[PDB]
């Protein structure tokens, strides 16, 4: 439905994150990560507001998800100190991009789906 | 080692999962389970040993992995009854079969890489 | 929302599975897996009214996911020959489980999503 | 080795192979200092990229370029590559093994560590 959705779920408590800070950025013609869209992870674990249609253009993108401090508040000293996900969007035409984190106090996980209108 | 390899990890810990029951099963021509072989995790989160060249067979396997009883040992309450990964082999011929199933207290994931002889 | 839902993606094109059979069984008092409820995975990729809340009693489920015809009908010879996922339900309230399994020709990941309602 | 990188295929069932790593520094600056590189073996590891002369505390990270392998393989992937950013050696030595588990549009990672 979104052109960019990225949820983040967790792997100790079987629940959605809750408090967990996003950031995307977006690579530049001279490289540079300048900041494209940021936000909160909500209770149901879920991140919108980050982009539409007309301003998501092609090129190469970066969606950082901080959860270094996300296990300190639950009291847990994690591994990451954040998760990365860099991809190519709109390469063809306009597709819709899903984005999924499944974390832990040592390991996440990424996929993506694509819905190829 | 074994034609058969079943290596088992921690999430939370970031640790190979120590003291996790493993349980083998061969597909019999009466659609039954039957034990064909069993054993304890290492601490290295590895399974060793678990058959032989003679003992493998061009048929339909099972292999089953005790979760529950090493998450309730750490004080932390799981959710899967067990891990179990069901699979046909060695039908095309004798291959081998290493199977990584990476642990968590609400999640776990399995996948199978397969390397000639 | 429905106590169990079980959904699958497909790594391979980015896309929810198509036409994925999907069984559910629950463990009879005599170590009888007897049929619960069974379905079709939809185009969308996800599977619900399996059961309601009267219907899901406290016990040991089991949901089966048939995978090996999955990847024949588009031309990928599968690995496994189905995917299983049994847990231990209502133990105290329905609590409405979730179940997320994500697929790949020789792997697949499974969560789970505990919520109290 | 101190830091290892294990990498596998989902759809092939096998380890990957020519597939490159980057491993970086952070410094003082907030610049990434380039640290270690190589190409992946037939086995999917990589060993030999650190040392404890060079291997020191601070934050780290780890490149595995997965854009070029699809392509090669005659398939159209969805990243770029994966990153692994992390702090190390926060209280004495440890050994990191750093898994990644690839796949068309989907890719996971582990850490384990090990005391000594
Ligand atoms: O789809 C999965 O099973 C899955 C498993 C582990 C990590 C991420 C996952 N992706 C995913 C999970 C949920 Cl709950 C989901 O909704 C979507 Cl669209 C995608």
Do not use: Q
């Not at 674990?45 to 969606?63: A, N, R, S």
């Not at 959860?67 to 000293?77: D, F, Q």
């Amino acid at each position: 439905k979104c052109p960019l959705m990225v949820k983040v779920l967790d792997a100790v408590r079987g629940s959605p994150a809750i408090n967990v800070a996003v950031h995307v950025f977006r690579k530049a013609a001279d490289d540079t990560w300048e900041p494209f869209a940021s936000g909160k992870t909500s209770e149901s674990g879920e991140l919108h507001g980050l982009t539409t249609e007309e301003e998501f253009v092609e090129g190469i993108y970066k969606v950082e998800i901080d959860t270094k401090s996300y296990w300190k508040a639950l009291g847990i000293s994690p591994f990451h100190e954040h998760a990365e996900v860099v991809f190519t969007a709109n390469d063809s035409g306009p597709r819709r991009y899903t984005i999924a984190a499944l974390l832990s106090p040592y390991s996440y996980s990424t996929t993506a789906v694509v819905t190829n209108p």
